[PDB]
Amino acid sequence: MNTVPFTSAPIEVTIGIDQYSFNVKENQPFHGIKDIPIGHVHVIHFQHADNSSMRYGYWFDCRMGNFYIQYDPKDGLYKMMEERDGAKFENIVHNFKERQMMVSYPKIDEDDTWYNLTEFVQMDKIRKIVRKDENQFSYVDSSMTTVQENELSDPAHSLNYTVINFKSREAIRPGHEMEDFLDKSYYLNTVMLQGIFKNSSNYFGELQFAFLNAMFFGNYGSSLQWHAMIELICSSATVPKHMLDKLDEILYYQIKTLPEQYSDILLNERVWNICLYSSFQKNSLHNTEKIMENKYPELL
Amino acid sequence: GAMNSSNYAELFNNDIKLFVDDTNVYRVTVHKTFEGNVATKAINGCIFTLNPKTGHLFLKIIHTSVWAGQKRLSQLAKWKTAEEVSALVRSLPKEEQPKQIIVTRKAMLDPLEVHMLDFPNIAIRPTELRLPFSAAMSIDKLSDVVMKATEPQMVLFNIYDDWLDRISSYTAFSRLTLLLRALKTNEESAKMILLSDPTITIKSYHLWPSFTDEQWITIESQMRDLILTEYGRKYNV
Ligand SMILES: CCCC(=O)N1CCN(CC(=O)O)CC1
Numbered sequence: 001m002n003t004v005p006f007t008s009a010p011i012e013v014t015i016g017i018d019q020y021s022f023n024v025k026e027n028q029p030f031h032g033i034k035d036i037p038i039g040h041v042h043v044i045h046f047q048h049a050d051n052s053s054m055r056y057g058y059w060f061d062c063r064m065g066n067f068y069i070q071y072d073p074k075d076g077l078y079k080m081m082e083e084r085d086g087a088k089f090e091n092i093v094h095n096f097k098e099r100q101m102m103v104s105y106p107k108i109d110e111d112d113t114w115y116n117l118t119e120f121v122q123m124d125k126i127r128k129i130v131r132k133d134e135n136q137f138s139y140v141d142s143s144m145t146t147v148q149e150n151e152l153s154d155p156a157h158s159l160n161y162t163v164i165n166f167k168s169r170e171a172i173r174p175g176h177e178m179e180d181f182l183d184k185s186y187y188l189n190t191v192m193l194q195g196i197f198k199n200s201s202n203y204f205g206e207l208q209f210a211f212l213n214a215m216f217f218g219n220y221g222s223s224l225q226w227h228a229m230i231e232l233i234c235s236s237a238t239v240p241k242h243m244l245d246k247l248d249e250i251l252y253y254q255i256k257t258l259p260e261q262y263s264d265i266l267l268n269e270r271v272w273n274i275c276l277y278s279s280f281q282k283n284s285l286h287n288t289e290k291i292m293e294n295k296y297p298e299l300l
Numbered sequence: 301g302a303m304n305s306s307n308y309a310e311l312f313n314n315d316i317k318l319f320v321d322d323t324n325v326y327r328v329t330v331h332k333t334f335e336g337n338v339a340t341k342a343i344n345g346c347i348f349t350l351n352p353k354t355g356h357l358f359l360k361i362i363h364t365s366v367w368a369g370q371k372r373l374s375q376l377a378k379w380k381t382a383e384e385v386s387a388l389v390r391s392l393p394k395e396e397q398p399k400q401i402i403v404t405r406k407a408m409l410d411p412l413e414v415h416m417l418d419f420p421n422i423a424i425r426p427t428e429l430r431l432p433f434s435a436a437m438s439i440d441k442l443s444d445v446v447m448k449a450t451e452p453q454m455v456l457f458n459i460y461d462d463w464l465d466r467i468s469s470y471t472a473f474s475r476l477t478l479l480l481r482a483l484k485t486n487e488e489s490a491k492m493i494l495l496s497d498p499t500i501t502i503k504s505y506h507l508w509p510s511f512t513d514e515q516w517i518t519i520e521s522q523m524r525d526l527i528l529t530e531y532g533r534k535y536n537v
Contacts, residue, residue, distance in 0.1 A: 167410070177379065177382070178414075
């Protein structure tokens with residue numbers, strides 16, 4: 001198990017670690033998070049008590065380095081940094097642990113939620129969507145726009161999700177206009193899976209990362225990407241069975257984890273009604289359809 | 301965006317534009333079968349593509365063979381319309397290509413946009429105007445060429461005859477829409493109005509009779525009377 005120490009907590013803040021969260025008071029003796037499960041990406045996120053504007057946070061993998069958080073009073077935020085001195089880092093963590101100044105990542109043993117939400121998410125792919133090569137961890141916030149949003153304005157601060165556009169030449173073969181617009185199988189299988197993503201795991205990893213950025217930061221462009229990647233599969237008549245069954249699992253755990261009160265801002269009525277009730281795959285997502293109907297029957 | 305009453309004069313400016321009406325592309329008669337079921341029989345149709353400034357009509361005849369063995373024909377008809385309009389644009393010299401295409405039915409928007417992806421600078425627009433272009437098949441010379449077609453064929457016409465020698469495009473379009481609205485509302489009575497004087501004929505090179513300016517005023521008034529009369533009959537007014 002790994003640890004992300006905090007130098008201190010000078011401003012009151014709600015701290016998230018994956019799907020958990022806790023409040024820290026101004027100048028409280030808080031010095032980090034321990035017992036973080038090895039084997040998954042993680043996200044440590046922040047919303048300031050005095051300014052709920054800018055949710056922000058950092059995607060990281062403790063296998064890649066030793067990371068800590070320190071507040072920067074000039075830029076006004078908690079920053080993730082890497083400690084290259086291993087003995088220094090171990091000494092810091094051990095003292096904070098001995099003084100019990102750290103919260104424990106509160107994973108229940110029966111609980112596979114985080115695995116289920118991050119099954120296909122890899123740090124190496126995150127670092128290609130979020131481009132800042134000098135760090136091993138990735139900053140995301142509520143306001144960052146996507147490459148696609150920008151096309152329709154600082155490129156160094158964009159979310160480089162794969163652009164999906166159903167009325168584009170990339171999606172429509174000349175001479176197959178009706179076919180390709182009504183059945184997106186070419187665009188999914190040849191353009192996206194074989195061409196850009198190389199395999200379904202990378203596709204699902206980006207879909208999962210988009211959902212998580214939408215949920216944890218309220219990042220609008222991420223929500224758009226998540227819905228586009230769902231609709232592309234559901235609007236394809238020919239999808240490998242293993243992908244359909246995996247999608248049903250992915251979406252089930254995403255809908256399960258979504259805060260009930262954020263459904264009006266995180267779920268697109270058109271996309272979900274189309275995917276569950278009109279699309280080629282309307283009968284292929286049994287688990288997702290059941291949770292959606294029982295949890296959000298109003299949306300439908 | 302959408303074309304409506306506010307931006308109506310735009311139809312007659314110097315930016316090339318075309319109206320596309322697909323209402324007569326897929327035409328059927330419905331009938332009983334020997335077993336007492338119902339079946340359709342397709343008849344030849346047409347795409348109505350009109351330049352409202354110049355009166356040039358590109359009448360693409362849709363022969364019934366294009367439906368043979370095809371399913372979901374009402375859906376296919378929209379995509380066939382878009383394919384043909386796109387083909388027409390590509391066939392025109394660059395300086396004759398439209399800058400806007402206005403579809404009379406909003407269901408044509410996506411099919412046409414998708415077929416025109418190679419022309420990103422050609423705006424595809426809907427309209428809020430209720431235009432009577434479905435009544436194009438009430439113009440005898442247009443109906444005749446559509447019905448006689450034995451294969452796909454593109455037929456070119458000027459739907460304003462020689463009117464632009466004497467009136468503006470705005471007035472010509474208004475006259476056309478009045479005539480078509482009257483033919484749509486009561487075809488028999490409208491045709492009677494247009495032919496009630498044997499001495500006024502349709503030139504071999506024209507679609508409409510050779511009325512003088514004063515006779516057109518009388519004809520237009522009679523067409524408005526017909527439309528109002530039919531409104532009163534319909535609503536018991
Ligand atoms: C007004 C009645 C004249 C007529 O029959 N058409 C035939 C087709 N059009 C020639 C062409 O297609 O280029 C001239 C108009």
